[PDB]
């Protein structure tokens, strides 16, 4: 069976990086933090171009995409059931192995319940105690309250989606249900209101496009990419849609006609686009403007 493309596949990362884009002004926007007096260097045009090159190297590492993983499976394993200790304790004991050189997902965290059962700690218990003994800058022991639906809606009205996601990466693990719930809610709000520009030149654009492709709702992102004159990106998105859905009618139509460039987007509109009529209209208008002006 042809392997399903992955998020980290070198081909997918290439397309996702391209559509994301780069903008040294957005990637390195000034942080509202304690400030220090700036330094100054006299540089030639060769030195200045070298410095810009290093800035683009750093902007690449800054735009490294966070992992996209499937939801973890609940831990429900009972190591022992020592019933002699039933009724001798009122509160659960949580024992955590805090040996320094063990990966956190390979640590043993067990719970001795009042009934006497010795069981493995759940995912919610594992993350909480690992924060208490291996505290991570940005993360809090107890889940913050900003992730409540009402609080998240407030952040969305202020167009602070990149912050909601940066907060979800500091607090939650990539495979947790809370992580997926928040990300899928932020991506969904961007879609409904056409706010795709908020996450461009950010590490969160790749996951957003990935989510739309898998959910077969790239119509909005294509219409917005076309209206911004980013039609090379729009074609790459249709290539990613024809890569993760090879047996789709649209992918089979492009093979029949060996479509390339703007042809790929036209094929998608007729075959699998939820709102094809608009994609052609926006695509046609772009062609008219390009042809008429140039």
């Amino acid at each position: 069976e042809v392997k399903k493309p992955a998020f980290m596949d070198e081909e997918v990362q290439r397309i996702l990086t391209k559509i994301t884009g780069l903008d040294l002004q957005k990637t390195f926007r000034p942080a509202i933090q304690p400030l220090k007096p700036p330094t100054y260097k006299l540089m030639t045009q060769a030195q200045l171009e070298e410095a810009t090159r290093l800035a683009v190297e750093a902007a690449k590492v800054r735009l490294k995409m966070p992992p996209v993983l499937e939801e973890r499976k609940p831990i429900n394993d009972v190591l022992a059931e020592d019933k002699i200790l039933e009724g001798t304790e009122t509160n659960k004991y949580v024992f955590t192995d805090i040996s320094y050189n063990i990966p956190h997902r390979e640590r043993f965290i067990v719970v001795r319940e009042p009934s006497g059962t010795l069981r493995k700690a759940s995912w919610e218990e594992r993350d909480r105690v690992i924060q208490i003994y291996f505290p991570k800058e940005g993360r809090r022991v107890l889940p913050p309250v900003i992730f409540k639906d009402e609080n998240l809606k407030t952040m969305y009205s202020q167009d602070r989606h990149a912050d909601v996601l940066n907060l979800c990466v500091a607090q939650f693990e990539p495979d947790s249900a809370e992580y997926i719930k928040v990300h899928h809610q932020t991506y969904e709000d961007i879609d409904r209101h056409g706010k795709y520009e908020l996450l461009r030149s950010t590490r969160h654009f790749g996951g957003m496009a990935w989510y739309f492709v898998n959910k077969k709702k790239i119509d909005g992102l294509l219409i917005d990419q076309i209206q911004r004159d980013l039609v090379d990106d729009a074609t790459s998105l249709v290539q990613l849609y024809h890569m993760l859905h090879p047996d789709g009618q649209s992918a089979q139509e492009a093979k029949e006609q060996a479509a390339e460039g703007v042809d790929l987007i036209k094929v998608f509109a007729k075959t699998e686009a939820q709102r094809g009529a608009y994609i052609e209209l926006a695509l046609q208008t772009y062609q008219e403007i390009v042809t008429s002006h140039s």
């Binding site: 400030l35 220090k36 007096p37 700036p38």
Partner: protein, 108 residues
Amino acid sequence: YEDFDTRILEVRNVFNMTAKEGRKKSVRVLVAVGNGNGAAGFAIGKAADRGDAFRKAKNRAIHYLHYIERYEGHTIFHDISLRFKRTQIRMKKQPRGYGLRCHRAIIT
């Protein structure tokens, strides 16, 4: 010159020895003026009455307006260290939000 503000820096009441009062009276006033937009100046006015020394200094300083270059309108372009006679001043360029941490006369 409604856009200019005047501030006092020193007021001396000095007495000399003239026949009018035996020991005559004198008021020497140092003032500074500025529009808060890069233009500032200072002058000394002397008179027998304090009110007159204020007018003389205040109107003299408007004729000696320096223009001071501000980096981005909030700070000096670079560190400045100098000695004027026996008084040493040492200024430092600082980021926004730092405020004016200087001698009370320099803040004015």
